[PDB]
Design a protein around this motif. Structure first.
Motif, PDB file in Angstrom:
ATOM      1  N   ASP A  44     -72.279 -23.825 -36.983  1.00  0.00           N
ATOM      2  CA  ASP A  44     -72.093 -23.432 -38.365  1.00  0.00           C
ATOM      3  C   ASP A  44     -70.648 -23.146 -38.766  1.00  0.00           C
ATOM      4  O   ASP A  44     -70.277 -23.395 -39.881  1.00  0.00           O
ATOM      5  CB  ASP A  44     -72.933 -22.182 -38.622  1.00  0.00           C
ATOM      6  CG  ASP A  44     -74.438 -22.478 -38.623  1.00  0.00           C
ATOM      7  OD1 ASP A  44     -74.843 -23.643 -38.835  1.00  0.00           O
ATOM      8  OD2 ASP A  44     -75.217 -21.535 -38.438  1.00  0.00           O
ATOM      9  N   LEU A  45     -69.849 -22.570 -37.873  1.00  0.00           N
ATOM     10  CA  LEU A  45     -68.489 -22.160 -38.205  1.00  0.00           C
ATOM     11  C   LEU A  45     -67.668 -22.092 -36.940  1.00  0.00           C
ATOM     12  O   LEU A  45     -68.184 -21.708 -35.887  1.00  0.00           O
ATOM     13  CB  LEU A  45     -68.544 -20.789 -38.848  1.00  0.00           C
ATOM     14  CG  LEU A  45     -67.343 -20.252 -39.598  1.00  0.00           C
ATOM     15  CD1 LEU A  45     -67.189 -20.952 -40.946  1.00  0.00           C
ATOM     16  CD2 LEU A  45     -67.576 -18.762 -39.800  1.00  0.00           C
ATOM     17  N   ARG A  76     -63.891 -20.550 -35.535  1.00  0.00           N
ATOM     18  CA  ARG A  76     -62.859 -19.621 -35.924  1.00  0.00           C
ATOM     19  C   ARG A  76     -61.738 -19.714 -34.910  1.00  0.00           C
ATOM     20  O   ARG A  76     -61.945 -19.469 -33.711  1.00  0.00           O
ATOM     21  CB  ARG A  76     -63.374 -18.182 -36.103  1.00  0.00           C
ATOM     22  CG  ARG A  76     -62.263 -17.218 -36.536  1.00  0.00           C
ATOM     23  CD  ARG A  76     -62.790 -15.851 -36.947  1.00  0.00           C
ATOM     24  NE  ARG A  76     -63.648 -15.939 -38.119  1.00  0.00           N
ATOM     25  CZ  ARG A  76     -64.447 -14.974 -38.571  1.00  0.00           C
ATOM     26  NH1 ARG A  76     -64.556 -13.806 -37.930  1.00  0.00           N
ATOM     27  NH2 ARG A  76     -65.154 -15.193 -39.684  1.00  0.00           N
ATOM     28  N   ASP A  90     -60.960 -20.390 -40.472  1.00  0.00           N
ATOM     29  CA  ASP A  90     -62.324 -20.753 -40.168  1.00  0.00           C
ATOM     30  C   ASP A  90     -62.555 -22.267 -40.158  1.00  0.00           C
ATOM     31  O   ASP A  90     -63.512 -22.728 -40.745  1.00  0.00           O
ATOM     32  CB  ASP A  90     -63.298 -20.028 -41.096  1.00  0.00           C
ATOM     33  CG  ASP A  90     -63.531 -18.618 -40.668  1.00  0.00           C
ATOM     34  OD1 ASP A  90     -63.199 -18.256 -39.494  1.00  0.00           O
ATOM     35  OD2 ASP A  90     -64.027 -17.851 -41.505  1.00  0.00           O
ATOM     36  N   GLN A  91     -61.694 -22.998 -39.447  1.00  0.00           N
ATOM     37  CA  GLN A  91     -61.835 -24.438 -39.219  1.00  0.00           C
ATOM     38  C   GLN A  91     -61.441 -24.793 -37.765  1.00  0.00           C
ATOM     39  O   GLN A  91     -60.619 -24.121 -37.125  1.00  0.00           O
ATOM     40  CB  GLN A  91     -60.961 -25.284 -40.176  1.00  0.00           C
ATOM     41  CG  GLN A  91     -60.760 -24.725 -41.569  1.00  0.00           C
ATOM     42  CD  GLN A  91     -59.897 -25.625 -42.450  1.00  0.00           C
ATOM     43  OE1 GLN A  91     -60.277 -26.758 -42.761  1.00  0.00           O
ATOM     44  NE2 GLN A  91     -58.738 -25.110 -42.879  1.00  0.00           N
ATOM     45  N   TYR A 102     -67.097 -20.083 -31.823  1.00  0.00           N
ATOM     46  CA  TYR A 102     -67.952 -20.672 -32.855  1.00  0.00           C
ATOM     47  C   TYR A 102     -69.130 -19.751 -33.121  1.00  0.00           C
ATOM     48  O   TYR A 102     -69.470 -18.897 -32.292  1.00  0.00           O
ATOM     49  CB  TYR A 102     -68.423 -22.094 -32.506  1.00  0.00           C
ATOM     50  CG  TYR A 102     -69.259 -22.208 -31.245  1.00  0.00           C
ATOM     51  CD1 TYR A 102     -70.652 -22.072 -31.276  1.00  0.00           C
ATOM     52  CD2 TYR A 102     -68.661 -22.475 -30.023  1.00  0.00           C
ATOM     53  CE1 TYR A 102     -71.411 -22.153 -30.107  1.00  0.00           C
ATOM     54  CE2 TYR A 102     -69.411 -22.589 -28.868  1.00  0.00           C
ATOM     55  CZ  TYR A 102     -70.787 -22.408 -28.909  1.00  0.00           C
ATOM     56  OH  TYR A 102     -71.508 -22.506 -27.727  1.00  0.00           O
TER      57      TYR A 102
END
Ligand SMILES: *[C@@H]1O[C@H](CO)[C@@H](O)[C@H](O)[C@H]1NC(C)=O
Ligand SMILES: [Cl-]
Ligand SMILES: [Cl-]
Ligand SMILES: [Cl-]
Ligand SMILES: [Cl-]
Ligand SMILES: [Cl-]
Length: 173
Positions: free
Chosen positions: A34-35, A37, A48-49, A69
């Motif tokens: 989902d994300l 960091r 946050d990529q 992540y």
């Protein structure tokens, strides 16, 4: 609920980056998270990529980076810390070499400043790296090849000299 397994964090083309040259940092975990960091430890700032593109390396961008992540509510264990190095911050040292005892070769990475750390490498794939806290290194059973050396300070070990001019070691009789 326990955390997830760590992602990898890689610098391409290399984590040893001359000032003004490009480098990309990439965090990679399993597909479909989902994300991501990605943080720099010196500032404790983050994005946050998963990807950070540095068009031109700068002294202030050198240092340790880390990423994690998230998936669901769960965080991963963090990556191994990436050690991003800026080269070419200081004048290049002078590299010399002499036969040692038997197949030992003595390499000297000599400088004017008061440096206490030295990294030496032989070109090739893979590269052979040597590191020391003093400027004279004994390479046991040294291979023929092209050697260069960097000098730096243990007080900021992510800012290295320009590399020395190459020296050619010919071991073959
Ligand atoms: C992420 O969570 C979803 C369920 O919310 C699950 O289907 C998937 O397998 C999880 N991914 C990882 C890498 O654990
Ligand atoms: Cl796990
Ligand atoms: Cl990666
Ligand atoms: Cl290199
Ligand atoms: Cl400089
Ligand atoms: Cl030696």
């Amino acid at each position: 609920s326990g955390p997830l397994p760590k992602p990898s964090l890689q610098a391409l083309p290399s984590s040893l980056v001359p000032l003004e040259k490009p480098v990309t940092l990439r965090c990679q975990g399993p597909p479909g998270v989902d994300l991501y960091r990605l943080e720099k430890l010196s500032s404790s700032r983050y994005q946050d990529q998963a990807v950070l593109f540095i068009p031109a390396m700068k002294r202030s961008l050198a240092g340790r980076y880390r990423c994690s992540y998230q998936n669901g509510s769960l965080w991963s264990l963090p990556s191994d810390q990436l050690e991003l190095v800026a080269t070419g911050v200081f004048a290049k040292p002078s590299l010399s070499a002499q036969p040692g005892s038997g197949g030992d070769v003595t390499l000297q990475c000599q400088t004017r400043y008061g440096f206490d750390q030295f990294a030496l490498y032989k070109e090739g794939d893979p590269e052979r790296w040597y590191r020391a806290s003093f400027p004279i290194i004994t390479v046991t059973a040294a291979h023929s090849g092209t050697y260069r050396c960097y000098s730096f300070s243990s007080r900021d070990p992510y800012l290295w000299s320009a590399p020395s001019d190459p020296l050619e070691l010919v071991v073959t009789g």
